[PDB]
Amino acid sequence: SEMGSTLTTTRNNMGGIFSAKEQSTAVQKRIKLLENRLEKAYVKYNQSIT
Amino acid sequence: REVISIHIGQAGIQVGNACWELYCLEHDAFNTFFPRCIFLDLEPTVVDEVRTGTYRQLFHPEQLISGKEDAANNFARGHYTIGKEIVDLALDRIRKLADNCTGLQGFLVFNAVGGGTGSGLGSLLLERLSVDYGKKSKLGFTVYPSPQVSTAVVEPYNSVLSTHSLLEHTDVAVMLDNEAIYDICRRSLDIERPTYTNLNRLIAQVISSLTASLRFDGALNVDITEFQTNLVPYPRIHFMLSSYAPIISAEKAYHEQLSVAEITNAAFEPASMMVKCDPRHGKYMACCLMYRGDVVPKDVNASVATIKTKRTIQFVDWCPTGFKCGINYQPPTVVPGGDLAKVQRAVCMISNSTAIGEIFSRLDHKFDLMYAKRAFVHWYVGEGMEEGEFSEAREDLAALEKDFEEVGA
Amino acid sequence: MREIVHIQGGQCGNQIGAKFWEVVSDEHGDSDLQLERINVYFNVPRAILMDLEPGTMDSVRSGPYGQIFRPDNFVFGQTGAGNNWAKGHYTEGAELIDSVLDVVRKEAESCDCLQGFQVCHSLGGGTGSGMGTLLISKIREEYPDRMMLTFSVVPSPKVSDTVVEPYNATLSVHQLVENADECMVLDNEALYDICFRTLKLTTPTFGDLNHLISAVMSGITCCLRFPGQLNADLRKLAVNLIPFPRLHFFMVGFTPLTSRGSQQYRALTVPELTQQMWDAKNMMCAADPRHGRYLTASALFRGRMSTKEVDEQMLNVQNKNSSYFVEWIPNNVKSSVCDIPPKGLKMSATFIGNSTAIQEMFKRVSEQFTAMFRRKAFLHWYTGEGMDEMEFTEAESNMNDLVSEYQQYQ
Amino acid sequence: MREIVHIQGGQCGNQIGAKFWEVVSDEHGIDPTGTYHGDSDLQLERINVYFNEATGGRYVPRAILMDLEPGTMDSVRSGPYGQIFRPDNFVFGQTGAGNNWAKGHYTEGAELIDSVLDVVRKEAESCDCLQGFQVCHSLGGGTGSGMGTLLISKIREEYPDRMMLTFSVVPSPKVSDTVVEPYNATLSVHQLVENADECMVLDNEALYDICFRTLKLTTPTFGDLNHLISAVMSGITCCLRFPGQLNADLRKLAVNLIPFPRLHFFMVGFTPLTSRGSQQYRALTVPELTQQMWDAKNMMCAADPRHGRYLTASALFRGRMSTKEVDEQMLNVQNKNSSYFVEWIPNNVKSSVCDIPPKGLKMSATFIGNSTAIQEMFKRVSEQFTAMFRRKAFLHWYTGEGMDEMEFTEAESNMNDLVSEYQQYQ
Amino acid sequence: NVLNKQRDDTTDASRLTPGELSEEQAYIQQLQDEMKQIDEELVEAEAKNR
Ligand SMILES: Nc1nc2c(ncn2[C@@H]2O[C@H](COP(=O)(O)OP(=O)(O)OP(=O)(O)O)[C@@H](O)[C@H]2O)c(=O)[nH]1
Ligand SMILES: Nc1nc2c(ncn2[C@@H]2O[C@H](COP(=O)(O)OP(=O)(O)O)[C@@H](O)[C@H]2O)c(=O)[nH]1
Numbered sequence A: 001s002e003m004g005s006t007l008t009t010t011r012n013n014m015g016g017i018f019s020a021k022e023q024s025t026a027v028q029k030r031i032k033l034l035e036n037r038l039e040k041a042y043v044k045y046n047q048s049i050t
Numbered sequence B: 001r002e003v004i005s006i007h008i009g010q011a012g013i014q015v016g017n018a019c020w021e022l023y024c025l026e027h028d029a030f031n032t033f034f035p036r037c038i039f040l041d042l043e044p045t046v047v048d049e050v051r052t053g054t055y056r057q058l059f060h061p062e063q064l065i066s067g068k069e070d071a072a073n074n075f076a077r078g079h080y081t082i083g084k085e086i087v088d089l090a091l092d093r094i095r096k097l098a099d100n101c102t103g104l105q106g107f108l109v110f111n112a113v114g115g116g117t118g119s120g121l122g123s124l125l126l127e128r129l130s131v132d133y134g135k136k137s138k139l140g141f142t143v144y145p146s147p148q149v150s151t152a153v154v155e156p157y158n159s160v161l162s163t164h165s166l167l168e169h170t171d172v173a174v175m176l177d178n179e180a181i182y183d184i185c186r187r188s189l190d191i192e193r194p195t196y197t198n199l200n201r202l203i204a205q206v207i208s209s210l211t212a213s214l215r216f217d218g219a220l221n222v223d224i225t226e227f228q229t230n231l232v233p234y235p236r237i238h239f240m241l242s243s244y245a246p247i248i249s250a251e252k253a254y255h256e257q258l259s260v261a262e263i264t265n266a267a268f269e270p271a272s273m274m275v276k277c278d279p280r281h282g283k284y285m286a287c288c289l290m291y292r293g294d295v296v297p298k299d300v301n302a303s304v305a306t307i308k309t310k311r312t313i314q315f316v317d318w319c320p321t322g323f324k325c326g327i328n329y330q331p332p333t334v335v336p337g338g339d340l341a342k343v344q345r346a347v348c349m350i351s352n353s354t355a356i357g358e359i360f361s362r363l364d365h366k367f368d369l370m371y372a373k374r375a376f377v378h379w380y381v382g383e384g385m386e387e388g389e390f391s392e393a394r395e396d397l398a399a400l401e402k403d404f405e406e407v408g409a
Numbered sequence C: 001m002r003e004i005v006h007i008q009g010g011q012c013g014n015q016i017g018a019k020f021w022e023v024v025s026d027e028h029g030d031s032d033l034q035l036e037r038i039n040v041y042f043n044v045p046r047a048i049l050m051d052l053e054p055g056t057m058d059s060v061r062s063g064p065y066g067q068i069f070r071p072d073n074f075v076f077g078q079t080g081a082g083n084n085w086a087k088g089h090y091t092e093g094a095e096l097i098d099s100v101l102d103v104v105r106k107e108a109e110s111c112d113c114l115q116g117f118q119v120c121h122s123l124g125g126g127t128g129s130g131m132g133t134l135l136i137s138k139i140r141e142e143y144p145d146r147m148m149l150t151f152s153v154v155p156s157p158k159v160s161d162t163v164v165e166p167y168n169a170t171l172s173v174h175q176l177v178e179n180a181d182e183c184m185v186l187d188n189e190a191l192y193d194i195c196f197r198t199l200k201l202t203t204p205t206f207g208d209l210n211h212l213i214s215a216v217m218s219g220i221t222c223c224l225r226f227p228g229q230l231n232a233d234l235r236k237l238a239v240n241l242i243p244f245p246r247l248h249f250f251m252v253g254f255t256p257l258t259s260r261g262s263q264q265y266r267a268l269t270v271p272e273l274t275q276q277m278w279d280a281k282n283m284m285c286a287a288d289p290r291h292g293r294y295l296t297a298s299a300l301f302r303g304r305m306s307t308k309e310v311d312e313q314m315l316n317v318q319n320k321n322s323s324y325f326v327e328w329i330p331n332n333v334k335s336s337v338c339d340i341p342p343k344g345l346k347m348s349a350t351f352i353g354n355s356t357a358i359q360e361m362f363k364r365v366s367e368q369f370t371a372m373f374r375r376k377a378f379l380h381w382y383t384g385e386g387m388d389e390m391e392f393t394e395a396e397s398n399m400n401d402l403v404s405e406y407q408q409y410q
Numbered sequence D: 001m002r003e004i005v006h007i008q009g010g011q012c013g014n015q016i017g018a019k020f021w022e023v024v025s026d027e028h029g030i031d032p033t034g035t036y037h038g039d040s041d042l043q044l045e046r047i048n049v050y051f052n053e054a055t056g057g058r059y060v061p062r063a064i065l066m067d068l069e070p071g072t073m074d075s076v077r078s079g080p081y082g083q084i085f086r087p088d089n090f091v092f093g094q095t096g097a098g099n100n101w102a103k104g105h106y107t108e109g110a111e112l113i114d115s116v117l118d119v120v121r122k123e124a125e126s127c128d129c130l131q132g133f134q135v136c137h138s139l140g141g142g143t144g145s146g147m148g149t150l151l152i153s154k155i156r157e158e159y160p161d162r163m164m165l166t167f168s169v170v171p172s173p174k175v176s177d178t179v180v181e182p183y184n185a186t187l188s189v190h191q192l193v194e195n196a197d198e199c200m201v202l203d204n205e206a207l208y209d210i211c212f213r214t215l216k217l218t219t220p221t222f223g224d225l226n227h228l229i230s231a232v233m234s235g236i237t238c239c240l241r242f243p244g245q246l247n248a249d250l251r252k253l254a255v256n257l258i259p260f261p262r263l264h265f266f267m268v269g270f271t272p273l274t275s276r277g278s279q280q281y282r283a284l285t286v287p288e289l290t291q292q293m294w295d296a297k298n299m300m301c302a303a304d305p306r307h308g309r310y311l312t313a314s315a316l317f318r319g320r321m322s323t324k325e326v327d328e329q330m331l332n333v334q335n336k337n338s339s340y341f342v343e344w345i346p347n348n349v350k351s352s353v354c355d356i357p358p359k360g361l362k363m364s365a366t367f368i369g370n371s372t373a374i375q376e377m378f379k380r381v382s383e384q385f386t387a388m389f390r391r392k393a394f395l396h397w398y399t400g401e402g403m404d405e406m407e408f409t410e411a412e413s414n415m416n417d418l419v420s421e422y423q424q425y426q
Numbered sequence E: 001n002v003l004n005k006q007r008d009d010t011t012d013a014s015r016l017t018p019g020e021l022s023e024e025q026a027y028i029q030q031l032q033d034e035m036k037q038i039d040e041e042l043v044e045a046e047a048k049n050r
């Protein structure tokens, strides 16, 4: 019974089965977006320089 | 390029009786098999069933070796007393089989370690093959006894005493239980009352899937020397879990949509291993994936990516590239009377991990309990053994347990 | 007159080269311009196949354009490597490389004035990488004053075929940094991503990837085979892209690349070729160039084009992205124009960029190498063959000081 | 010369634009396969405003389709003139907003508009001297409202010195499809007041009454409404594509029609619009065109200008006409109905003429009136929004996704000051 | 037997729980800093042009 209770509370704590992949894939996509944005900002600055 | 197969014992040649049936039914590609075989046993009953069977004319009469009387589930009897008169005749034939050959990849041996012939003269044959050739590979697909399903009583004595030589003689050793295969036929093949014949048919499927790279041209071929590097990270750690997919009936196969992604997954769940052990307790050291038939390299590439990103199973900290793929074009063949449906593509996975470290530990207690009271020891000692080799084989498995625990860390 | 002999090693090298000789033979065929410059690749092709597994050689004679090679040039072992660089470099090489050197010397002296040799191989396999590596070394000490090209694919953790890829890649690059004149780094990850994004294929088998690599190789040697408004042979590009003798690992891109659904919806102009050429998503290496700087860059153009457009466009791409180029070199871009396009197009282009973002891959492999080599996994299959411990330490040292000089110049 | 890229958002935006490219291509003589078959040189000389020659007489439209559902995109390539768009211009999500403005502006917008902007950026640098951008969308939906809204804000931050049109249908209580229309309308307009250069207010009520009484149609499917809207949009840009006696570009109309920077919501009409029973019984003169033009029922918005006063008004005429008739007609319609026009601006009507009519008609017109009656619509939706917000109905998909309470209070405040400053300037 | 089955499931559930990615969050933080640096760099350059 105690092990069953610990199982249920840990099961609720993981926040779902698919939760880990979504958070992992979301932060990875976020990495890509900042990289893309940084390139456009660099281009504007270098264009301003010329 | 050719590879010859040796079959020892009641279990060995019955596995071969199904394996060679598949080879003839499957077939210049034949050159690697056409047979280059040898059956050998101490009891003449099962060999002489082949001599009168449907494949009378197929096998050359001399090939089928047969002794006079059985070792009778006695490792010492089949290794010291009766082996000594038949093993010389067997290996002095296998030599001229190799002289017939020119580009020998290796030998592959089939034996069950529970018995006396499969275990005793198995190791004896292996020791003279290792001193005679040394470099040539000898793949041993052995059948270890299950934890809870069992047919004999003294098999712990045999399994420990056989393993002590299976370490340093064979190159690549694949475990196979009977309970795990029984569970496979019950779960996936939904056969509730299976016999030995069905087990041997799907064992042949695994063997065929790992030699099809030599026989037929694929997108990415893989020889027997390739497994030698890509799966054994240490000279004494070569014990491989096996799996296969899709093991599926004739009706379910059409209903389901077999593809590359899901069968790469299905070949990784412990519900489909050929050995009764849970790899969730262990960490994968290396994996090897043989793909047959309708496979493009992209989806196999995509499939290994999803496995690596999952967290239900873990790898050792040592291998970021913990895989070895292999693709062959010809699809797997079917046998009339067989239960496996025709599939466009199949996967045979051979891995290496630390879950195997559990089976040896499980084995130790059963052997330990019987040995402490000296049960059945008088049979083996009067055969020619002593108390020395019992205790020393015991401490060899103790070392192997510490070895797996050290490497797994 | 100026001559390029071909060497293909391993399964990867053989299948790439088979597609390569298809496209070159088709290129040389109406026009009399095709007949005047076939000595560079013909006498039968001036090629040498080399492997250890007969399936690849049989697979070569089976397919079309497989009956045009001279069977004497099928120099070939029988036992096989098994993805073991030590086997490909110490045991099996020791009896097949002597034979390859016989045939390569015969194919080299058959012509009058060699321009160089052209090797296509891999860096993960054993008989491709290791034997081709030893072959390169034997060639360098005999012919030092001739050009040398190596199109080598590098493994990625995302496309991880075998388990011992780092053990082979690290050792292979340890020889490339001293032997080859220059190399064009390739990989399967970028190739698969290119066929997804730009080419939009659903089933990209190796035939497509090998077709892409073949288009690059045909493009780099067009200046020798055809007249142009501005000619640049292999030696001319080498001196314009290599500022220091060990900094000769390049990244490649080919243009134009469009899906068959959009082939008729697009325009083909020099600005349009340059936008796709400098696109970071269009490199055939998994090294994002915007993670570093460009040392130099080169663009080889094919087709009747206005040279003014070429020079003003390259000046533009250097003025706009002014932070991505090296400072102590102004006008980092070398250009060339040839008047004959590849079959099926009007105007094509080939990009070769020597950037400092390539140090990511070399560092990216070393951590896998150091991971295995720390606790000696898979080491005995190399050690018990003839290699010792100091070889891996030497290979690791050269990887580390290599990424340092990119980091230094960056 | 001067180039306008086209951006269509959501289902309403996509279908409006499909009929738009069909009508335009017919004007320039491009067949559905994308090749040139015209006769006059006047058609070939000004196709750079809307197309690009690809290879061998292949003219592709300079348009960008953008939404969140696959059904709309597939419905574009299925119909004719569906094979003319470049497939790379189909920037496209998969999940959907579900008429949730927050999902269109905070949840799903964050992963699509970057991709939309790459295609839009490519189409801006593909041309030399931009005249402006052209966005067709709705105000009651989610993927048209929120997605197009954030796109407009980002674009004005990138290219600020360029014109911008937004053709937007607005919701009304009688034609009420979605339930959260007020939440979408007031927040969407709150963004349009500070981002768009000028907006063109449309609504579905007026479209239904035009097809009832004027057109006298029996089964007016959405194809006819989109057919009507396309004629108006082609009229606003005919000056760039064809020479005339009095040209009027987009900048010329905006600087002339917008007296104060926040008051840039227009009412539109189109002439001639006649039924098949009366297409024979009519004449084609400038005064006949003018009265049917300034008619109250003929406005393409359901806001009667005769409830208020006109601030400024504009006329775009097409066809061989005499400029004296143009000027004297505007003077007469302002002198008789003198109270309906604002007083502290004399000559509140700007007029222009172009010498190329639409295909199939001898002479047409297009009216763009900036009246003060538009505050009715802002109040008509504002009270519905306040009615809902004072009990927090339908709020948890808004507040649970990223909005707070102050955003709705900001929307009401901006709503209330705009209707108050309309009231002052009238 | 049932206790061992339950225990394995708990260990699996604990493995799955999403864990903070240190090697990636710091990348995001560093990317934003460079982004903000370029914005301020851009405003000085625009001032210079006027
Ligand atoms: N998979 C499989 N296993 C078998 C088969 N026949 C026997 N075995 C296994 O063999 C083990 C005992 O060894 P046997 O092969 O039956 O007999 P043996 O090895 O020849 O030894 P002896 O009885 O002394 O002749 C049992 O534990 C069985 O699990 C078979 O047909 N298929
Ligand atoms: N592009 C391409 N890559 C290939 C091809 N065949 C093999 N490879 C790559 O080569 C590597 C394996 O090379 P391998 O066959 O072991 O070379 P070898 O054993 O020395 O001949 C893998 O990483 C594959 O991705 C091919 O036809 N095309």
Ligand SMILES: Nc1nc2c(ncn2[C@@H]2O[C@H](COP(=O)(O)OP(=O)(O)O)[C@@H](O)[C@H]2O)c(=O)[nH]1
Pocket: D009, D010, D011, D012, D013, D015, D016, D138, D140, D141, D142, D143, D144, D145, D169, D171, D177, D204, D222, D223, D225, D226
């Ligand atoms: N003119 C016209 N309006 C439409 C059409 N389809 C939908 N609408 C309008 O769009 C509003 C609902 O917006 P919706 O289509 O869901 O916008 P979206 O989801 O953002 O694309 C309704 O008020 C309709 O009047 C159409 O084909 N033509």
Ligand SMILES: [Mg+2]
Pocket: B009, B010, B011, B043, B115, B116, B117
């Ligand atoms: Mg027996």
